[PDB]
């Protein structure tokens, strides 16, 4: 249904008439992408202490 399909969901298409078959399992958040290519560790309070 079009109730299940949400924005920026990677889908499957069959190039015969472009008919949607299944939702595709894969999908990455676009922010997970930008945070990772940057790369920045996080920490806890005891390793920054003293």
């Amino acid at each position: 249904n079009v109730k299940d399909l949400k924005a920026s969901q990677r889908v499957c298409l069959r190039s015969d008439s472009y008919m949607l078959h299944k939702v595709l399992e894969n999908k990455a958040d676009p922010l997970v992408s930008l945070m990772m290519v940057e790369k920045v560790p996080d920490s806890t309070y005891d390793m920054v202490g003293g």
Partner: protein, 71 residues
Amino acid sequence: RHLKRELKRAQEEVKRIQSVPLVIGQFLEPIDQNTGIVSSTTGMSYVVRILSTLDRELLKPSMSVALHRHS
């Protein structure tokens, strides 16, 4: 004993599909393990079935791979 003749005639068929002529794409990642995402070397993504009875030991990390032509 008759079906051992028929397992051999079915094994032959499929080895001919394995071999040349093939285009070379790349394996990005699985979405199952009987189905995966490959980018051909035409600059497009395709969702393709995976021939069962293959080694996924080196496959799952992205790595070159062979694909059939029309199929």
